[PDB]
């Protein structure tokens, strides 16, 4: 009800009322079509994607390298495709999954260029006065994936 203006009647935040959904759906469809027609004509440049892999989310783009700390049972130089793209972006548009993007909309290619074992790491435990001292050396294996192409398709 009515309450005369004071410092606490209304809260200190603005009354933000959202647009009516009937028109908002049309607006969203229009902008989606605009982005789609950008994609069809090749109106974009270099691309970047947020690829989910071994357990990590790598922000990657064409020609870059990535180092996974787990062997991937792939021969040297065998092309592979990285599913689970969370976000793919260009200069003017970017596409966000919920939480992944469809297999058709984005295609990320990578290659296995090197498989090796990481530099030696030390694990030393020590406790004072209890004669408790032990030392271990671990070399976790790892593999380097080059990313060869992020291609996009006009399926929106």
């Amino acid at each position: 009800g009515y309450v005369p203006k004071t410092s606490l009647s209304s809260p200190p935040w603005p009354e933000v009322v959202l647009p009516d959904p009937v028109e908002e759906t049309r607006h969203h469809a229009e902008v989606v079509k605009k982005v789609n027609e950008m994609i069809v004509t090749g109106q974009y440049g270099r691309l970047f994607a947020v690829v989910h892999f071994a357990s990590r989310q790598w922000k990657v783009t064409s020609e870059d390298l990535i180092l996974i700390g787990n062997e991937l049972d792939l021969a040297c130089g065998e092309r592979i495709r990285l599913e689970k793209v969370l976000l793919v972006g260009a200069d003017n548009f970017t596409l966000l999954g919920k939480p992944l993007l469809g297999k058709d909309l984005v295609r990320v290619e990578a290659t296995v260029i090197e498989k090796t074992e990481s530099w030696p790491r030390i694990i030393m435990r020590f406790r004072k006065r209890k004669n408790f001292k032990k030392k271990r050396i671990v070399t976790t294996p790892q593999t380097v994936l080059r990313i060869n192409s992020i291609e996009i398709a006009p399926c929106l």
Binding site: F53, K84, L100
Partner: protein
């Protein structure tokens, strides 16, 4: 970090729990043929399988126990009728 919200919407509290992120195959070959599944997926299939087998086994045992009780009630409540003749 919205574990409260995720559990309020029938989702796993931990996005690395069960979902498209953790169990879909992380990669395929370039040509299209799928990849030998990941160890974590195999281990989770095995543990879920064991969970299901235990579920069915316990439920079966409880139902069979109820049926056995029914049989004993029959053969002790009715076999006393055999002493109600002659």
């Amino acid at each position: 970090a919205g574990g409260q919200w995720r559990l309020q919407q029938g989702l796993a509290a931990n996005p690395s729990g069960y979902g498209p992120l953790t169990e879909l195959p992380d990669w395929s070959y370039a040509d299209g043929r799928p990849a030998p599944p990941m160890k974590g997926q195999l281990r989770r299939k095995a543990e879920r399988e064991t969970f299901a087998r235990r579920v069915v086994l316990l439920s079966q045992e409880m139902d069979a126990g109820l049926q056995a009780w029914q049989l004993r009630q029959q053969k002790l409540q009715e076999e006393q009728r055999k002493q109600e003749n002659a």
